[PDB]
Paper text:
The riboflavin biosynthetic pathway is well-studied with dedicated enzymes to perform complex chemical transformations, with the exception of an unknown phosphatase that catalyzes the dephosphorylation of ARAPDP, the product of RibD, to generate 5-amino-6-ribitylamino-pyrimidinedione (ARAPD), the substrate for lumazine synthase. Using an anaerobic activity-based screen, two phosphatases from Aquifex aeolicus were identified that dephosphorylate ARAPDP, but only one reconstitutes riboflavin production in a one-pot experiment with the other four enzymes of riboflavin biosynthesis. The structures of both enzymes were determined by X-ray crystallography to reveal the vastly different folds capable of performing the ARAPDP dephosphorylation chemistry.
The second enzyme, a histidine family phosphatase, only dephosphorylates ARAPDP in the one-pot experiment thus facilitating riboflavin formation. The structure of HFP was determined to 2.04 Å by single anomalous dispersion using selenomethionine substituted protein. HFP, like all histidine family phosphatases, is composed of α/β/α sandwich where the central six stranded β-sheet has one antiparallel strand. HFP is a dimer in solution, as estimated by preparative gel filtration chromatography. The HFP active site, or “phosphate pocket,” contains four highly conserved residues characteristic of all histidine family phosphatases, R8, H9, R58, and H149, as determined by sequence and structure alignments. Based on published mechanisms for homologous phosphatases, it is logical to propose that residues R8, R58, and H149 form hydrogen bonds and electrostatic interactions with the bound phosphate group of the substrate, while H9 accepts the phosphate from the substrate, assisted by a proton donor, likely E82. Water hydrolysis of the phospho-H9 is assisted by the proton donor, E82, resetting the active site for further turnover. There is significant density in the phosphate site that was modeled as sulfate derived from the crystallization conditions. Phe93, Trp107, and Trp169 form a hydrophobic the cavity that would enclose the pyrimidinedione of ARAPDP, similar to hydrophobic pocket generated by Val11, Val15, and Trp181 in RosC. The HFP identified in this study has the appropriate specificity against substrates of riboflavin biosynthesis to be a dedicated phosphatase for this pathway.
Author numbering:
A (entry chain B), B (entry chain A): 1 to 203
The structure:
């Protein structure tokens, strides 16, 4: 069938600082670059035939390490850029949770019914990732990698499995975490979520 | 937080041969025994305080290896023994698929709406799994491991996330694959699915 390896980008400066990022565009940390290089190991034997990446720098530079070390075509796709969080971007997340415990808890339980104030319209968000997924179904490659963001990669999984974006924060992906989604021409199968085997050497 | 490590049992003879098993009870292969031994590597920092296993031999023996090396109690719970598949137990799976493609495809797509002939009643199955999961919430341990079977572990995951047993064959776990579910007193978060990092050495 088709193998789709979803890969959350490596650690960015705002991730390290615990800051809600969204459309903000911080650089990879020195650790992020290390994580990206280690990620290569997971793909030397079975090389993806294409890497598709968010244009945001934390995602692009993760994808580029793979594209360059393994010699793989890289495509940028704006449809998997992170969800915008409007007036909450740039804020320390746990500071924001202490001041708005119920807002955050409701949003994590069901972000469709309880969106954050000024966040990207959830129906517009769903539309762009759904179109991206439809395009993935049609692609000709047998093995592809998608480097994206928490929101967009969790959303893609929720749609592929038909469980709805209500569930998008019921799952987790760490930086450079890999989740393998297989597609047989009709339906999807989740074979793994948040594999960080390649980072064990940093323990 | 409570950390609940779900662990699919190690490879049994029927798994290695591609034979539908269910309530049948084949022993671990030589590979299953090494997989059970490698599993300990995952619990080097975070040690479970208890291991809970299915009584079936492939599960019990996997769990006993872990409990012996870590030095912790092994409890046995009938409620996570595998779903019964009735008269189909003991049939070569791929042979059965070729002769009954539509029966198998429908069952994988929605096993609630399209149960297999003579399979365990899905409402009884759900009941025992849900009662097991409710006891898990009340346990006093902060970290524990559950060694089970595809059907019962996928089903626990589906119920914990609220996505329904219709999705139980939309996710996969390999032999000794680990999936970390966290419980915060109110709801669940899936942190990983089908982690086999401990088996990297065998590749």
């Amino acid at each position: 069938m088709k193998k789709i390896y979803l890969i959350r980008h490596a650690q960015s400066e705002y991730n390290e600082k615990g800051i809600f990022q969204g459309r903000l565009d911080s650089d990879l940390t020195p650790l992020g670059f290390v994580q990206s290089r280690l990620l290569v190991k997971q793909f030397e034997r079975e090389k993806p035939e294409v890497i598709i990446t968010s244009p945001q720098r934390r995602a692009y530079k993760t994808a580029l390490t793979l594209s360059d070390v393994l010699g793989i075509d890289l495509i940028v796709d704006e449809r998997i850029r992170e969800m915008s969080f409007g007036v909450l971007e740039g804020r320390h997340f746990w500071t924001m949770f202490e001041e708005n415990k119920e807002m955050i808890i409701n949003w994590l339980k069901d972000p469709v019914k309880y969106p954050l104030p000024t966040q990207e319209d959830i129906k517009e968000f769903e539309k762009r990732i759904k179109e991206f997924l439809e395009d993935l179904k049609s692609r000709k490659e047998k093995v592809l990698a998608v480097v994206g963001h928490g929101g967009t990669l969790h959303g893609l999984l929720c749609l592929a499995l038909g469980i709805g974006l209500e569930k998008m924060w019921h799952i987790h992906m760490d930086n450079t975490g890999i989740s393998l989604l297989e597609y047989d021409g009709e339906r999807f199968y989740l074979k793994s979520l948040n594999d960080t085997c390649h980072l064990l050497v940093l323990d």
